[PDB]
Design a protein around this ligand. Structure first.
Ligand code: FES
Ligand SMILES: [K+]
Ligand SMILES: [K+]
Ligand SMILES: [K+]
Ligand SMILES: [Mg+2]
Ligand SMILES: [Mg+2]
Ligand SMILES: [Mg+2]
Ligand SMILES: [Mg+2]
Ligand SMILES: [Mg+2]
Ligand SMILES: [Mg+2]
Ligand SMILES: [Mg+2]
Ligand SMILES: [Mg+2]
Ligand SMILES: [Mg+2]
Ligand SMILES: [Mg+2]
Ligand SMILES: [Mg+2]
Ligand SMILES: [Mg+2]
Ligand SMILES: [Mg+2]
Ligand SMILES: [Mg+2]
Ligand SMILES: [Mg+2]
Ligand SMILES: [Mg+2]
Ligand SMILES: [Mg+2]
Ligand SMILES: [Mg+2]
Lengths: 72, 97, 74, 128, 118, 23, 86, 142, 48, 137
RNA sequence: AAACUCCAGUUGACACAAAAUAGACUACGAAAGUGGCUUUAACAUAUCUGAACACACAAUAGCUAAGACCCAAACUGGGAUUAGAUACCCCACUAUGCUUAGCCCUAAACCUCAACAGUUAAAUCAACAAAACUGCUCGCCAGAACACUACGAGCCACAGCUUAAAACUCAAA
């Protein structure tokens, strides 16, 4: 899927979230999925750059209180 | 048709291929310190790739570099130069007691 | 065998038959000898698992076809 | 053979190559290169002397010229290495491959076949 | 082409070492070489004892000469170094910096079936 | 496989070499 | 002959334990292939025989490594029976 | 496959070498052609595990200094015992030291051998001082 | 670009006039080609 | 300091000493362990011969010259003649895989000498003379 | 046992011989072959197939001539074992293995798989080997044995090589 490209980058940059996946809940949303949804919203607002669309997404989540610890 | 159908593309989660410790670095016959890390301390024997972990290309470069350095007067043949015994041990071989 | 107990109960409850145990040679193709000349064989065999425990097809898949018994199978 | 002072085929058309130091001209000449570089100059000389389009390297003419340069290199090699059976084989195979090319060029374009024979000094011979 | 002369010189005092290097670099120039650089690798103990010109050597001065020369100069230079009594061992190799290293993606596995059958 | 066909040829060649030697 | 002495194949003795020093030296020479190389060099091995043995050895190692890998993989299920009675 | 045969049909079967399986086995059943192979190769694995423990100082300081060398290691088919052989030293005084430390180490070594989860189920290991020709030794004492 | 780079290097090339100066300027210097590699692929330059 | 199995390198400044003598000054016991005999020569660090003993010089002959007890006896004999000349510590250099390879070293110790190091110098040609053909037995 | 005792050990000096480890790699070359180092030259063909004989090659052994000679070694001599001789074992040593210049042209020269192109669907397929086939071309084969033979012919080959029958005989091979 197109979002798999965003997931590969998110896992490389920020790693797997210290939050644990709950695959029993069919509506579970991980930090990566929350990142992907925000990344998708900002792309639809007309932004087309990839490196810029990725940095603005992290800021939005930090504003919402999400913990994003860069791996390196 | 349908937006949720899978799309054709290359694996985005694919990991890079493994690399030997010497991948991307020039192997010179004059760099005896590097070459000495791949010979036996007691016998000077060149280690096989199963001990050095090197790839086929670098295993050959190191081997050819050692043979050149030995016969040109840069590297001993029958033992590892004792100056290089305290260098990083990059070879998967355990000897002593 | 993780589901042997569950399947035997489901068969008993619906009023049908279950065979989750080791399948002996000839239960279907040699049934008259094993059970008697008047034994009635199954009209339908349902496989909830079509493979045996060595990852080969359950022998009853072939033997059901030999005896012309229709099979349902996951 | 081209003079040793001849520049390499790669550096002959760079702007300002005639105003560089003499040392830089020696380092970009045939004198400081392997024999394969001298053969590229020979091939280019024959291509412009003979073929109509010197930049068409896939034409039957260019292949005969390229192979004729290799044949001359093998003959020079074997003049010094007379027990080299490997290169003696390559020479005889190359001569046979050129004859097959010349046969096909003679059959398709005789006017070009004649210029190739004159230009390269080949005396075409019919087989026994 | 571009060559690298790995030169092991007899352990001598500074004046005789400079005279040997000058005499060796001039031999290269007389044969048509363009000398690019001269590097001192230092005096050290040899990896083994070397006998050269009716003498035994245990130490030597290691020097490098980076230079360009015609292909015919190598054979003539190798002969010159064999006669210089102050040269313990001299070897001419193609300069390693000329050979460009090809990029490597990584280590692709080789299947076990190929190992045996091949 | 067996080598019986080779053995026949072996003996034939041996006897031939032996005949050639004698004569 | 021309090399320095008392560096190659040299083991120091600890607390007068010469048996352990000799075993360490023997282990070094074995791992480096010298002990088996000296033995094979007592008599000439004919080139066709050396290739045959070098090919047999190479294939026995590949076969033993592959059989160990299979046993390790199929030993994960050596745990007790989870569905005993069924 | 190779000249070494690998045709066994039940190749996907999960090997279960445990003491309990031997009791739940058909008495008529006899070892198959490729059934010995797993035993020959599993016994070799035990040799590999034991050899590393001896030469690594982390396992035990007393064991490391001894520098014990394993002559042979062959498990039993019963799954009740394991036979391991270490080479004896010349000095009978030194022999006593090695056996004593090895005798006490064996109990812990077993738990350390369980660290290899693939080889977790290890039958109690027997260690045999290599008195290969004790007949002369015992005869000369008397 | 290769002709330009090469034209600057020729200024530092040894010549018969500057041979003695460059020979002596080398006996005072030291060039070290030695370095070691680590299990992580990092170069460990010598302690000099 | 931790023990090093690597010998001290000459020219470096080591702290190891044996009767006030450095490693480079300890006499050397050269043991030649052949298939049919064992020869032991003790020499000083300057290559001065101090003692020689072999199974043949100790009265063993023919198939007896090549045993463990014969080499052990030769070691004791060489140790005795070497001890008289002032030798206590020796460096052992053994070449060959004969039966007296280890036994010859034991005899040197039973004779009163202390072995501080063991060196193997068994000749291994790196490619050399062609060996004789296999024995048809 | 014989042999050696200008023997053996240490140390130093010192090859026209052979090329540990790397190599658990599977590369180069038409094949034969090729695994110490350096440099030079250098690895045919922009459709494929195309020769017992044309052209050029071709392990080992061998021939001719001139050199080298550590080690190995047919042969030979001596010692031993043996009823005894030869062999197997030990010692010494030669042709030969090496170099050079010519020949000779053989191999279980075998991945025992002809070259090229294509396919993985049909029937998967006598068996075994090495999954089963298609197109196309050259070479070759037609019971066994006689027979890697005879004769003829060609060949630097002369107790040789290549090509290669028939008669008698059998019901198998
Ligand atoms: S993995 Fe890239 S050179 Fe070794
Ligand atoms: K070699
Ligand atoms: K090898
Ligand atoms: K074959
Ligand atoms: Mg016959
Ligand atoms: Mg006698
Ligand atoms: Mg063709
Ligand atoms: Mg024909
Ligand atoms: Mg042909
Ligand atoms: Mg032929
Ligand atoms: Mg030939
Ligand atoms: Mg010859
Ligand atoms: Mg000899
Ligand atoms: Mg001779
Ligand atoms: Mg040679
Ligand atoms: Mg072959
Ligand atoms: Mg063909
Ligand atoms: Mg079949
Ligand atoms: Mg017939
Ligand atoms: Mg023949
Ligand atoms: Mg004939
Ligand atoms: Mg005739």
């Amino acid at each position: 899927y197109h979002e798999d490209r965003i997931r590969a980058k998110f896992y490389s940059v920020y790693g797997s979230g210290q939050r644990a996946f709950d695959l029993f809940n069919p509506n579970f949303k991980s930090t990566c999925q929350r990142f992907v949804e925000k990344y998708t919203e900002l792309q639809k607002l007309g932004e087309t750059d990839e490196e810029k669309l990725f940095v603005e997404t992290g800021k939005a989540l930090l504003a919402e209180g999400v913990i994003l610890r860069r791996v390196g | 048709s349908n937006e949720d159908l899978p799309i054709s593309m290359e694996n985005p989660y694919k990991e890079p291929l493994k690399k030997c410790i010497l991948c991307g670095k020039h192997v010179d016959y004059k760099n005896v310190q590097l070459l000495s890390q791949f010979v036996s301390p007691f016998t000077g024997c060149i280690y096989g790739r199963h001990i050095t972990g090197l790839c086929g290309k670098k295993q050959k470069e190191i081997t050819k570099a050692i043979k050149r350095a030995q016969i040109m007067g840069f590297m001993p043949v029958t033992y590892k130069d004792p100056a290089y015994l305290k260098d990083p041990k990059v070879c998967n071989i355990r000897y002593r007691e | 065998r993780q589901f042997s107990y569950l399947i035997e109960n489901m068969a008993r409850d619906c009023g049908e038959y279950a065979h989750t145990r080791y399948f002996r040679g000839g239960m279907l193709t040699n049934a008259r000898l094993l059970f008697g000349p008047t034994v009635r064989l199954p009209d339908l065999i349902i496989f909830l698992h079509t493979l045996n425990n060595i990852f080969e097809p359950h022998v009853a898949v072939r033997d059901a076809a030999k005896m012309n018994i229709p099979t349902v199978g996951i | 053979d081209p003079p040793p002072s001849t520049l390499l085929k790669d550096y002959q058309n760079v702007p300002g190559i005639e105003k560089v130091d003499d040392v830089v001209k020696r380092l970009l000449s045939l004198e400081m290169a392997n024999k394969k570089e001298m053969l590229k100059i020979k091939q280019e000389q024959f291509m412009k002397k003979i073929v109509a389009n010197p930049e068409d390297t896939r034409s039957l003419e260019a292949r005969i010229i390229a192979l004729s340069v290799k044949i001359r290199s093998y003959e020079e090699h074997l003049e010094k290495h007379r027990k080299d059976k490997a290169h003696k084989r390559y020479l005889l195979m190359s001569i046979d491959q050129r004859k097959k090319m010349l046969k096909n060029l003679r059959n398709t374009n005789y006017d070009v076949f004649e210029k190739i024979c004159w230009g390269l000094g080949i005396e075409y011979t019919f087989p026994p | 082409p571009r060559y690298e002369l790995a030169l092991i010189l007899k352990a001598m005092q500074r004046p005789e070492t400079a005279a040997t290097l000058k005499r060796t670099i001039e031999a290269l120039m007389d044969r048509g070489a363009i000398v690019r650089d001269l590097e001192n690798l230092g005096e050290r103990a040899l990896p083994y004892r070397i006998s050269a010109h009716s003498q035994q050597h245990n130490r030597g001065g290691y020097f490098l000469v980076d230079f360009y020369a015609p292909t015919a100069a190598v054979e003539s230079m190798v002969e010159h170094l064999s006669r210089d009594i102050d040269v313990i061992r001299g070897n001419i190799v193609k300069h390693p910096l000329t050979q460009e290293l090809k990029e490597c993606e990584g280590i692709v596995p080789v299947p076990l079936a190929e190992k045996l059958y091949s | 496989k067996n080598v019986l066909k080779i053995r026949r040829r072996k003996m034939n060649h041996h006897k031939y070499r032996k005949l050639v030697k004698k004569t | 002959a021309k090399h320095l002495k008392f560096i190659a194949r040299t083991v120091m003795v600890q607390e007068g334990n010469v048996e352990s020093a000799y075993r360490t030296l023997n282990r070094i020479l074995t791992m480096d292939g010298l002990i088996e190389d000296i033995k094979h060099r007592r008599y000439y091995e004919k080139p066709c025989r050396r290739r045959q043995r070098e090919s047999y050895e190479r294939c026995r190692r590949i076969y033993n490594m592959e059989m160990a890998r299979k046993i390790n993989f199929l030993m994960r299920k050596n745990r007790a029976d989870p569905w005993q009675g069924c | 496959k190779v000249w070494y045969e690998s045709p066994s049909l039940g190749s996907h079967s999960t090997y279960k070498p445990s003491k309990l399986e031997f009791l739940m086995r058909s008495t008529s059943k006899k070892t198959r052609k490729e059934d010995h192979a797993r035993l020959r190769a599993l016994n070799g694995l035990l040799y590999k595990a034991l050899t590393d423990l001896l030469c690594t100082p982390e396992v035990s300081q007393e064991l490391y200094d001894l520098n014990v060398e394993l002559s042979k290691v062959s498990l039993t088919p019963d799954f009740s015992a394991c036979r391991a052989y270490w080479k004896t030293t010349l000095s009978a005084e030194q022999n006593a030291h090695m056996e004593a430390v090895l005798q006490r180490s064996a109990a812990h070594m077993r738990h350390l051998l369980m660290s290899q989860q693939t080889l977790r189920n290890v039958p109690p290991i027997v260690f045999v001082q290599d008195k290969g020709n004790a007949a002369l030794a015992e005869l000369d004492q008397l | 670009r290769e002709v330009l780079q090469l034209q600057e290097e020729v200024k530092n090339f040894i010549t018969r006039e500057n041979l003695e100066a460059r020979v002596e300027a080398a006996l005072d210097s030291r060039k070290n080609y030695n370095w070691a590699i680590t299990r992580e692929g990092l170069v460990v330059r010598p302690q000099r | 300091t931790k023990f090093s199995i690597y010998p001290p390198i000459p020219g470096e400044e080591s702290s190891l000493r044996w009767a006030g003598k450095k490693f480079e000054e300890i006499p050397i016991a050269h043991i030649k362990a052949s298939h049919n005999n064992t020869q032991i020569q003790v020499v000083s660090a300057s290559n001065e011969p101090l003692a020689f003993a072999s199974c043949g010089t100790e009265g063993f002959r023919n198939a007896k010259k090549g045993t463990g007890i014969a080499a052990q006896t030769a070691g004791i004999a060489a140790a005795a003649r070497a001890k008289q000349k002032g030798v206590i510590h020796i460096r052992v250099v053994v070449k060959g895989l004969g039966p007296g390879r280890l036994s010859a070293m034991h005899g040197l110790i039973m004779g009163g000498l202390e072995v501080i190091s063991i060196t193997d110098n068994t000749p291994i040609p790196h490619x050399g003379c062609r060996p004789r053909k296999a024995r048809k037995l």
